[PDB]
C-alpha cells in the first residue's frame, strides 16, 4: 500500500455510517408554551414534501399551546407489545373416515401464512427474527375432551417424514416430540430462531435456484428455503385406529422480536398460502367511499 490513492482509500470501510441515533422515548413528548409569532423569513408551517421526509412542524409553531406534561407511555407500541400474543397459525384435522388425514396421522408444513390475522400482522415488516411459543389445543370437532394420546413431532428439513401412523420416524430418537393427552391442558413449547439466515423474510424477490425459469417452474418464485423450518407431524399413539375424530389448533406467540424494513400493509384479500396473489377483478379501495368530497 504505497500509492497515495490506496493510502487515502475508503475501500473496506465496514463501519455503518448512520446519520440517526435512537433516543429513549418512554412517554409522549411534552408540550411547551408558545405565543404568537409575527416575523419574516422563517416559516415552520411551510414544508417541501418533494424531499421525501415527514413534516417537522409542531403544535408550538402553528398554534398557541400550553405546557402539557405528557406521561402517556409508549411501552404498548413496542414489537413485543404487538407480537407477543398467541394467534391461530395452524389447524390439522384427523377425521375417523374422510379424505384429508384418514389414517390417524397428519403432516403440516410449518407456515404461518394460512390465516389472515397473523399473516397481515407479521407481513407489516419484511424481515423478522424471533423465538416462538407454540401452543397446541386438541379436541373433537364438536369440542369435546376425550381420553386420547397424541404424539407431536417436529421434523426439520431432511429428516424422515412419517408415511403412516406406525412408521419408524415416530421412534423420535432425535426429533423433538411431545406426548400429550386431550384431557391434559393444551401443549405448549418454545422454539428458537432456526433459520439459516439472520431473520425470517416473509417476502423473497427471487428464485431459490439457478437455471432457466420457464413457465412450469414459476411456483418457486418467492420460495425462500430459509423460512422452511420443516414439518409438524401429529399422530394418534396406537397401532389401531383412534375412536374419535380430532382437530389440533396451533397458536404461535412470538417473543424476543426484532423487525426490519416496514412495508405497506395488505389491503386485498389473501388468496393462497405464501403468495401475494390477489383477485384482479375484485380490487377494492383501502377504505370506505362517499358520494362527494364536500359532504362527509
Amino acid at each position: 500500500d504505497r500509492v497515495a490513492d490506496m493510502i487515502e482509500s475508503s475501500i473496506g470501510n465496514s463501519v455503518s455510517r448512520a446519520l440517526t441515533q435512537a433516543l429513549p422515548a418512554p412517554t409522549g413528548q411534552n408540550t411547551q408554551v408558545s405565543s404568537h409569532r409575527l416575523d419574516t423569513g422563517e416559516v415552520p408551517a411551510l414544508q417541501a414534501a418533494e424531499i421525501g421526509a415527514s413534516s417537522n412542524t409542531s403544535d408550538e409553531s402553528m398554534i398557541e399551546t400550553r405546557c402539557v406534561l405528557n406521561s402517556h407511555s409508549t411501552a404498548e407500541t413496542t414489537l413485543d407489545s404487538f407480537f407477543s400474543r398467541a394467534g391461530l397459525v395452524g389447524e390439522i384435522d384427523l377425521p375417523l373416515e374422510g379424505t384429508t388425514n384418514p389414517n390417524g396421522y397428519a403432516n403440516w408444513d410449518i407456515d404461518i401464512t394460512g390465516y389472515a390475522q397473523m399473516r397481515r400482522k407479521v407481513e407489516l415488516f419484511t424481515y423478522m427474527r424471533f423465538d416462538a411459543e407454540f401452543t397446541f389445543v386438541a379436541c373433537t370437532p364438536t369440542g369435546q375432551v376425550v381420553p386420547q394420546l397424541l404424539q407431536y413431532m417436529f421434523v426439520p428439513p431432511g429428516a424422515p417424514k412419517p408415511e403412516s401412523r406406525e412408521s419408524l420416524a415416530w421412534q423420535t430418537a432425535t426429533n423433538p416430540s411431545v406426548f400429550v393427552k386431550l384431557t391434559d391442558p393444551p401443549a405448549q413449547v418454545s422454539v428458537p430462531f432456526m433459520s439459516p439466515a439472520s431473520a425470517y423474510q416473509w417476502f423473497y424477490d427471487g428464485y431459490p435456484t439457478f437455471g432457466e425459469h420457464k413457465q412450469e417452474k414459476d411456483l418457486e418464485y418467492g420460495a425462500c428455503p430459509n423460512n422452511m423450518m420443516g414439518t409438524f407431524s401429529v399422530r394418534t399413539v396406537g397401532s389401531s385406529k383412534s375412536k374419535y375424530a380430532l382437530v389440533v389448533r396451533i397458536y404461535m406467540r412470538m417473543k424476543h422480536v426484532r423487525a426490519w424494513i416496514p412495508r405497506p400493509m395488505r389491503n386485498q384479500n389473501y388468496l393462497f398460502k405464501a403468495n401475494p396473489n390477489y383477485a384482479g377483478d375484485s380490487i377494492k379501495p383501502t377504505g370506505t367511499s362517499r358520494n362527494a368530497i364536500t359532504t362527509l
Binding site: 446519520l19 422515548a25 409508549t74
Partner: peptide, 22 residues
C-alpha cells in the same frame, strides 16, 4: 430463548424513516 418476553427498552428512532435526509 425459553425465557419470558419481559420488557423492551423504550428507544425510538423516528428519523430513520421520517427524516432520512443527508
Amino acid at each position: 430463548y425459553a425465557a419470558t418476553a419481559g420488557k423492551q427498552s423504550l428507544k425510538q428512532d423516528p428519523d430513520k424513516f421520517a427524516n432520512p435526509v443527508k
